[PDB]
Design a protein around this ligand. Structure first.
Ligand SMILES: Nc1ncnc2c1ncn2[C@@H]1O[C@H](COP(=O)(O)O)[C@@H](O)[C@H]1O
Ligand SMILES: Nc1ncnc2c1ncn2[C@@H]1O[C@H](COP(=O)(O)O)[C@@H](O)[C@H]1O
Ligand SMILES: [Zn+2]
Ligand SMILES: [Zn+2]
Lengths: 299, 296
């Protein structure tokens, strides 16, 4: 049994698929209170956008996602044929056959990260002002990694603060957030460490990309011991993308150059699970300071 | 379209019709409408929050595929070996189509918020007397691309679901047809409640729509958004008979297959209806509307 398994009964209901769960009112009230807490830390001049769980497949392909995490991508498929073809697919399904043979990809994918749709949006506004742009983004994300662990979901909520500007704007933002994020986790009564990290790039070339990314310090994670202190869970990430998105989307910074980007990502579901694992499922027993910052009556 | 000017302060394009990024203004109103629906939650109602995906086998079992095959969004993935996945990416790099390596997952994008609730209720055994009530929500998907702000591919649905005897479902329906009109009235919305039909696919479906409307299986709260002649369904009451009770083996307190019904709130249509009715300046909204939404 996994150390988080005991939480499942009070927090989730099975939906017949690993990593896809219905949330209880108790679980959801904490996710919303954590979301409101992240919002209270929003810097002045930050534009808030809320993304749906799907995005343009062409934007995602253009962003280089297939080259990095093809095995994690969820693509939207549908029955796009003629009425004759669709009726036949349904008739095959009626006869105990497989209707899915008539599926073809749609022009949409399930979003793998909340920030992806923001880059073309920022690019369409022209050159960046001095100091760059700041965005507060959120989406229900999807990653094709089935697991029975409560901290490894296929559908989960992501919340991010995104900086688009010169390498200086991004570095400063990332440093500000690595300080602020630790202060938030500390106030939430969570045990953590901030360490060098890498994205789970696919395959043999992915192992090379990961080592190269880690050495360049382009990604840090706020890690919380859930199942062990040896294998902690990344509940937040601090990502510096250099000019990857600036170049892809033709975003130009103050110095006329291809814009640099970075993001602070909060795993909403991992943070909520971390809260319940740390403090238990009885909110009335949560520490006074933790209850206070989440807007529950302190005492 | 009469709703078109709203797009500027409510949405941002995402490069796909019916798929939009929401502004802070738009989202604050959706959340306030959600909190208002919550304040009308009956005692003993269990609240569940569903992700945007659900079991494909549960959806296939519910009969959605037989009625709306053209609306279903399924989840596909690259489920092969590392060698196969690398080849698909390499074909994409060489100007080819990587999607040929896709196969269906065991998941679909949810077409309605209530679907996952029926197997959940069935797994608990026989129903207590009075039945069960659920408050459910999900980001839903319907494969119907459109440029109209009230016809989205990805939209939020909020529902109250009743599972029990036909008496329990009838009482719930009556209660909600009254409560839903009181909510729209308090929101300062103009509407009518009329008989309705689901958009069943094909020629065989047109007769299913006629047969559904002749029966009182579906009522809709319609709001003039583009015109008074063609209003927008912003809420619905659906009666499913014992379809879900039979499919999932849900038995009422009398040992019979349970009947189910649901009151569905289109969160995005309601928010769009609010902005079209009252404008994009919240400070100019009527005082009673601002009060019920906690804006004052
Ligand atoms: N499979 C998952 N289950 C739950 N949360 C996740 C999952 N993958 C990523 N996240 C969360 O989202 C945050 C940002 O993801 P990443 O893009 O991998 O840095 C991570 O730090 C996690 O907190
Ligand atoms: N394509 C759509 N775009 C936005 N909202 C929708 C769409 N389809 C349905 N809805 C909303 O969801 C509610 C219930 O959907 P239905 O199950 O078709 O009756 C309706 O009352 C609408 O308010
Ligand atoms: Zn990001
Ligand atoms: Zn329903």
């Amino acid at each position: 049994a996994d150390p988080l398994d005991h939480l499942a009964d009070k927090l989730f209901h099975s939906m017949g698929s690993d990593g896809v769960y219905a949330r209880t009112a108790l679980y959801e009230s904490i996710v919303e209170r954590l979301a409101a807490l992240i919002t209270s830390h929003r810097e002045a001049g930050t534009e808030a956008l809320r993304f749906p769980p799907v995005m343009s497949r062409a934007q995602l392909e253009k962003s280089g996602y297939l080259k990095s995490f093809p095995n994690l991508l969820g693509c939207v498929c549908g029955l796009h044929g003629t009425e004759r073809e669709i009726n036949a697919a349904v008739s095959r399904f009626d006869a105990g056959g497989d209707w899915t043979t008539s599926l073809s990809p749609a022009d949409l994918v399930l979003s793998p990260a909340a920030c992806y749709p923001v880059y073309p949006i920022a690019a369409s506004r022209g050159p960046l002002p001095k100091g760059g742009l700041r965005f507060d983004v959120a989406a229900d994300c999807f990653r094709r990694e089935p697991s029975k662990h409560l901290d490894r979901l296929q559908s989960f909520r992501m919340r991010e603060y995104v900086c688009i500007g010169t390498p200086d704007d991004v570095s400063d933002f990332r440093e500000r957030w690595m300080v602020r994020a630790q202060a938030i986790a500390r106030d939430l009564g969570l045990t953590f460490r901030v360490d060098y990290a890498s994205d789970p790039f696919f395959g043999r070339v992915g192992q090379m990309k990961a080592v190269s990314q880690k050495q360049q310090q382009l990604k840090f994670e706020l890690l919380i011991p859930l199942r062990s202190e040896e294998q902690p869970t990344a509940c937040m990430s601090f990502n510096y993308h250099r000019e990857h998105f600036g170049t892809t989307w033709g975003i130009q910074d103050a110095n006329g150059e291809p814009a640099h980007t970075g993001c602070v990502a909060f795993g909403m579901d991992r943070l909520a699970v971390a809260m319940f694992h740390t403090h238990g499922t009885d909110l009335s027993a949560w520490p006074a300071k933790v209850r206070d910052i989440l807007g529950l009556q302190p005492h």
